[PDB]
Design a protein around this nucleic acid. Structure first.
Ligand SMILES: Nc1ncnc2c1ncn2[C@@H]1O[C@H](COP(=O)(O)OP(=O)(O)NP(=O)(O)O)[C@@H](O)[C@H]1O
Ligand SMILES: [Mg+2]
Length: 392
RNA sequence: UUUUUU
């Protein structure tokens, strides 16, 4: 409905000149697409697919806004290249976090379901295969530690047979701060002829430069600064001078933000669990998710939040990227995003608020400012994006 | 700090 109107508007990133039929996907892939409920490509899908499906295959570094369909663009490229007759990994997709790997894997299964023979392996924590076992599935989705184990020490995968390598959230996967060391070690194991696809909603300048040097001869799709922020996510702030006041303000807002699901973002695992415990003392049911939890607990909590069994997720940056829950209508930055140094983290900011307003929905983001220093950070973020954040 | 392997 909003989607139908937006896909008719040439100013929207959801608009495509061409239909799925005109993109010339394999018929089993068009089946997967229409079964997903898709009607028309978004812009990134219609722009990236021809580059990725050109023969000979081409490398791509591409940027597109939050919630514009980057996942299906890359999944389709992986699925187009696989030969379901060869029973070994041919495609490798890396994600920065456990829940994101699980989520994407689900998309792969669903879009590839009309290739009865195609099967998916999960190279994630808690996923063990006896020694001397080589993996049979043609596609692998994983997080970097495990995949890097699977490739060499344990030898479950021959990396020299991989023909498509995908980095989702490509800028944190290759950043020195992020997963650079594991990603580049995995990459070095690939054969020369392997197609490399990097997708993100953001690339800091030096990361953009670095991607051009680790990806041979890439095509590039890059946004202008003004294009990065969505008109559909309203940005506010609340001025407060203490943790307790923020919590107070949060208590104040909680009805208005709980109409539809919310995610709340904290700087540390410890603040995350403190906040979740304090909200439960007020009689609110919230679910806590952070990387100190066991994977079985992490999996069960994200699934319950997806099922609407939990309305409020209190979390760390573990959920900042890529997590797609269509009912999330509010994002709260309880803490403002800062890098390891404590400088303002523009990229994370944009990904956190991108949890809401997915694929044509509207959303709201509320920043909790607790100091002058925090206020400095907020003004910095606003200047980076040139998008004014209203006082609430 | 946040993630991230057996
Ligand atoms: N052509 C399409 N038509 C309708 N819905 C779509 C289409 N492509 C993707 N979607 C839905 O769009 C939502 C967001 O897609 P997703 O691929 O997660 O966004 P993304 O670009 O990866 N964003 P981020 O990972 O947050 O930078 C998902 O629920 C998709 O199922
Ligand atoms: Mg994504």
């Amino acid at each position: 409905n909003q989607v139908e109107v937006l896909q008719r508007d040439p100013n929207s990133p959801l608009y495509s000149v061409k239909s799925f039929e005109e993109l010339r996907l394999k018929p089993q892939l068009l089946q997967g697409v229409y079964a997903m409920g898709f009607n028309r490509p978004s812009k990134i899908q219609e722009n990236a697919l021809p580059l990725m499906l050109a023969e000979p295959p081409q490398n791509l570094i591409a940027q597109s806004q939050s919630g514009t369909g980057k996942t299906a663009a890359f999944v389709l490229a992986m699925l187009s290249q696989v030969e379901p007759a060869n029973k070994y990994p041919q495609c490798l997709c890396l994600s920065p976090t456990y829940e994101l790997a699980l989520q994407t894997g689900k998309v792969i299964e669903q879009m590839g379901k009309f290739y009865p023979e195609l099967k998916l392996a999960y190279a994630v924590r808690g996923n063990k295969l006896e020694r001397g076992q080589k993996i049979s599935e043609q596609i692998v989705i994983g997080t970097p530690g495990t995949v890097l184990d699977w490739c060499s020490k344990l030898k479950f995968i021959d990396p020299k047979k991989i023909k498509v390598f995908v980095l989702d959230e490509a800028d944190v996967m290759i950043a020195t701060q992020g997963h650079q060391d594991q990603s580049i070690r995995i990459q070095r194991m690939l054969p020369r002829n392997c197609q490399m696809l990097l997708f993100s909603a953001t690339f800091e300048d030096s990361v953009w430069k670095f991607a051009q040097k680790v990806v041979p001869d890439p095509n590039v799709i890059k946004l202008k600064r003004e294009e990065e922020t969505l008109d559909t996510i309203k940005q506010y702030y609340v001025l407060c001078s203490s943790r307790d006041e923020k919590f107070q303000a949060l208590c104040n807002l909680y009805g208005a933000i709980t109409i539809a699901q919310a995610m709340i973002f904290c700087h540390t695992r410890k603040t995350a669990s403190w906040l979740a415990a304090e909200l439960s003392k007020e009689g609110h049911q919230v679910a806590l998710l952070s990387g100190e939890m066991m994977v079985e607990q992490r999996a069960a909590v994200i699934e319950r939040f997806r099922e609407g069994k939990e309305k409020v997720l209190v979390t760390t940056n573990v959920c900042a990227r890529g997590i797609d829950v269509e009912q999330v209508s509010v994002v709260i930055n309880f803490d403002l995003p800062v890098d390891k140094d404590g400088n303002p983290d523009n990229e994370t900011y944009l990904h956190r608020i991108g949890r809401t307003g997915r694929f044509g929905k509207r959303g709201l983001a509320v920043n909790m400012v607790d100091s002058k220093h925090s206020m400095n950070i907020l003004n910095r973020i606003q200047e980076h994006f040139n998008k004014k954040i209203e006082r609430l």
